[PDB]
RNA sequence: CCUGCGGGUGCACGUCCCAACUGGGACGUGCACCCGCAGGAACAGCAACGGAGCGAGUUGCACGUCCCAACUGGGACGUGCACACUCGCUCACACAU
């Protein structure tokens, strides 16, 4: 799509169209994956997401 | 070594400092700032009934939270909430901005009593980021720029900014805010017809809907349909209390007046807030103002109108301090214990 | 170049193709995509594929985002018993599969017009 | 001496002369219950419940002449309605 | 230095119930000190054994029952308890209290374990890959059977990692965080079933229970046989210091809440807190929870309910702060001082 | 017995089941010496202890 | 093949007095020599220390790679106590095949006889020649 | 009087057609949008008469002496070691200057 944002050092969102931030890295695409509400790939999320540390739990605060 | 002096000092408090000032500009939720509260009686005995707004047990905290969701792109709000209410098994779930189906988002759903606060919500500040393409080319970006200052008032906007601009392609995209019910579609044919080469939108992504932002815990639909999993198998909330906030979240804009434990279960059942009960209340309070009724425990009672400034509150012996507009605290949560007083005797 | 684009892959990029596996796993999709059935490529296709019960290699490409599309993907690889491993870019495998359009992941079935390359690069792969 | 039947859960692997059977019902069966096939046959009793505790698995020891390979992927295993628990009861 | 006063080392760095006790909210400071108590670390060698504990790495061979009165009869006490029992074959982490600590067994049962297994696989897997998949879906909340009653019951696997494989061998090492009552043979049994090969724990090593481990002052049997002998035939207390810790240090993770010396007897003779005796208290209590009430020294009078949280204590004037659930501290040790209140009436 | 350890810079105990440890000195065995209650050697080991400085009260106080 | 100096190394703190290299040597031959009478070597940590506390004279081997000490670190002072003198060696394996059982033993108690008194004697000179720390 | 409660469009899925994290069609499933009732009538009480401490009920291990065939595992002979409620007694019944 088209949207897309980087962050800067607050981790405030900057929203541009440019497919590379002017820090050389690849642009976020704004929109979050497409949901669908009949999905059984529930435990293979966390399995997965946890070994790279990346679930909500496992942020602080 | 520090251990030996540890082993050896007498390290015990010391007999006094003379101050005893509290630092409560960290407490969570309606408890900030606790302290600077005008305070006008500590006399009142607490009952061991409820909990505190972000340790309550899970089914009370489901009960009574709200999400903070990134709308995915394909559908619309309701059916959003239609899911929330499926995946987390709950009686009642709402929300206060319908986004349109081909928007992204905040999107702010309550669940199942935090549904009292809908209404409230319903004029709540909010900000959006579109991009947009233009029939034709314009002479420069200047241009385009002088165009978005042009429609920055009653159309509301009260802020706009355009955040990127490609002219090969001429789509660019602008974050605005706006008071709730502006429909954004409408402002940039407007803002395209003022150009003078008309235009339409493409994308929308809503970033702010109130008080709660993209930064403020926003959580997917997979974070949702995850915690629950998670939940229903591992029987671990740790992924439902980082997804669901406490419903008190919403309502740390407002001026407190907190109010003894006796008067909370009379609220419920509907009584205004008299005087006898308010133990502290925040400076700031005036006439026909919308102000959250509070327990001790940070617990949000009610929203009720003010009908004493804070002045007179702090000059006053008796009378109505408040009136109600919505009791959020369910019944018989507290004990009920009106009828008791000495006057009322 | 290679390095730099491993960089901007995404942090649930592992195990990931060195150069030279890049090389080997990218003419494997060129020789694969020859025959029509034989190649799964697209989410929607590999997934109900893997979900059937379909067998051989598994690609993933680690530029995308957000995962959560293709966060599940591994671990069904995982369970089903399906060697994988990602690719730094996707502009590769669509370069690589006859399409400038890039393409996220692919499933390569077992033909033995390109045997010896397929279990090559299936040992390089368990081997990591 | 079954009087009832019902689908506990299909078929998982095999681990020596065992045989984990994905169980489904959310209910726990009882240790050592006799696990019969779709005619009420017993082809062996529950030896070890491991597992979350939604979606788990239960293994069983043949013995009375059924094998771990006679059996055969997606095939099903009931038990007896009595011999189970709630799985609020552990829980 | 030797002579350096307390208030000149910071106060993060203080005796093991004090650690930050600026960090807590000050209802009061003033308070008249008495002259009995001791530190918790300054205690006469006669109270330290009677009112400490220990952290044995417990040998190969010998039950958990056998170590305890092994250190009963080598320190001549009356009394002595252990909050786990490990097997007769099993190594690793005991905290063994001495006397007026077991009083502080019960509360330490449902602490977080952990254990460092060795499980050998019958067969061949194909790749450690394989093993660690196999530990991954071990986790969260899990049924188990008592080893050779046979009730089956749930506890949790916070969190597991392999350390070690060795395929010619196919032997390796796991290192898992477990609930209290979690067995690991089980764990290592149904391991084995999963990764569809069969395997046995045939070695277990205890690394940490509750918030004591094998690198937070863990020393042998042989260190207490020494420290007695050194005290017997010497009249050295140094190494029976080393060996032996105050049971303040199983409570530094209750919150707490300060009283005055007036108030520490009363709680012994089975008073309930309340707010007027009250120095300080800290953040994040909760109703229904466990804290452990200090003496302005360190000492820990007894270990009490919250009945109040944190916001509510700063809003009050009197009442009951906490009940009572285990008291620690022997009776008499601080004289009565209670009906002298300000009204005394 | 299996399960031996060498220490990392943290002084942390890294379990292995290797006789040899990484940095290439030999693994220290993970399980406490058999204890039998009737033991008359506590001179003994007092007196080797501290020659070579492996006391209890030798290393320096914990930071309780 | 490991060396010498890198195997000491290995041993732990409290293996002292080490013997050298060449009274290594000395004290692997005289072991070899001294299996010949079964009755005239203790082997083990059990024997050993029942032979020491029953008052048996010799001089005692021990093994400097030994983890934890608190299974034979008692030993070395009961040595002291009663007069027996007493080298560490510089790995287990030497001694084990110095018994040719392959089985390393953490120690060794080595008597007098006449075939090999010469031998007896010039390594106990050499073990006091060392002297303790 | 106050309160609470009620009064053909798109989308997701599975299966087939063809010509990205897709747009296109069809078939079927599903999901979303196009005054009455009840509670209370509240001026917000309660700075100790139920809490604590004790007692009772609801085979292996280590030593030594021996037999033998690593910090061992084995045998025998003797040693010592561990395997939530109710009922009683006592204390005070405490708002902590």
Known sequence: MYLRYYLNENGDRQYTLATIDPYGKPTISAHPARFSPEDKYSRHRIIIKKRFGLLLTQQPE | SLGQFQKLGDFKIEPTESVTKLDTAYWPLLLKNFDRLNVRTNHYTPLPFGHSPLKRPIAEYV?????????????????????????????????????????????????????????????????????????????????????????????????????????????????????????????????????????????????????????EGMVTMHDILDAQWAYENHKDESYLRRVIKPLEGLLVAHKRIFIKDSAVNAVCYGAKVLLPGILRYEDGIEIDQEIVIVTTKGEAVALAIALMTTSTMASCDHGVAAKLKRVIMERDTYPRKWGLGPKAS | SYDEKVDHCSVIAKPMAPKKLSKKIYKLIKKSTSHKNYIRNGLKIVQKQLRLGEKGIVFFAGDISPIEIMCHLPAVCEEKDIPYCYTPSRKDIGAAMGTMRGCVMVLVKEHDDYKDLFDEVRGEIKLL | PPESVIPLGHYGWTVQDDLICKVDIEDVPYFNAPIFLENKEQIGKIDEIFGNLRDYFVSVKMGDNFKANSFKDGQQFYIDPAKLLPLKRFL
């Not at chain 2, 759903?109 to 080319?137: M, P």
């Not at chain 2, 355009?162 to 995209?173: A, W």
């Open chain 2, 63 to 215: 009960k009574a939270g709200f999400i903070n969701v990134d709308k995915p792109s394909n559908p619309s709000s309701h059916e959003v909430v239609s899911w929330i209410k499926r995946i987390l098994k709950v009686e009642k779930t709402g929300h206060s901005g319908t986004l349109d189906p081909k928007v992204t988002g905040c999107l702010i759903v309550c669940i199942d009593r935090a549904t009292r606060l809908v209404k409230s919500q319903q004029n709540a500040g909010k900000e959006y980021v579109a991009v947009f393409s233009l029939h034709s080319a314009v002479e420069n970006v200047k241009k385009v720029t002088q165009g978005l200052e042009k429609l920055r008032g009653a159309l509301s906007v009260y802020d706009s900014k355009l955040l990127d601009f490609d002219k090969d392609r001429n789509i660019g995209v602008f974050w605005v805010s706006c008071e709730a019910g502006s429909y954004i579609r409408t402002m940039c044919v407007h803002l395209g017809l003022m150009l003078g080469v008309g235009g339409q939108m493409i994308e929308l992504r809503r970033v702010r809907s109130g008080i709660q932002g993209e930064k």
